[PDB]
Design a protein around this ligand. Structure first.
Ligand SMILES: Cc1cccc(OCCCNC(=O)N2CCN(C(=O)c3ccc(Br)o3)CC2)c1
Length: 121
């Protein structure tokens, strides 16, 4: 399965599944400072799933590793901000992260395999 470009539609498909998840709803759009006025004291680099989808659709990811770094930033920001490990929203982030990681592993493996096959000779 040595298609170097296949990761892109596989990531579009996985972002579609994440948007159906009720657990994604807090992570879809950038955090509102009005409601969370200390957010940007704690979080240097905001990230959300709409920004990830738009970066993908613009052709501004070169690999699924770059997409994976930005999605992992959504989850590390939720960890950096939770006032408690037992917060509702952090708890939603942990389930959504498990789902993401379960599905992205084959996307990454197949991409890396395809690049190695391209460089085989
Ligand atoms: C106009 C409109 C329409 C529809 C949705 C929309 O966006 C929803 C609000 C965006 N989420 C949000 O506010 N947060 C998500 C990220 N945070 C945490 O991860 C976190 C950890 C513990 C706690 Br508590 O929060 C901080 C809160 C905006």
């Amino acid at each position: 399965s040595y298609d170097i470009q296949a990761w892109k539609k596989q990531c579009e498909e996985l972002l579609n599944l994440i948007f159906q998840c009720e657990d994604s709803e807090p992570f879809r759009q950038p955090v509102d400072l009005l409601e969370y006025p200390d957010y940007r004291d704690i979080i240097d680099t905001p990230m959300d799933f709409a920004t990830v989808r738009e970066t993908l659709e613009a052709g501004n990811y070169e690999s699924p590793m770059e997409l994976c770094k930005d999605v992992r930033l959504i989850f590390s920001n939720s960890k950096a901000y939770t006032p408690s490990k037992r917060s509702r929203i952090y708890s939603m982030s942990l389930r959504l992260s498990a789902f993401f990681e379960e599905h992205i592993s084959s996307v990454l493996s197949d991409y890396k395999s395809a690049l190695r096959f391209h460089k085989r000779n």
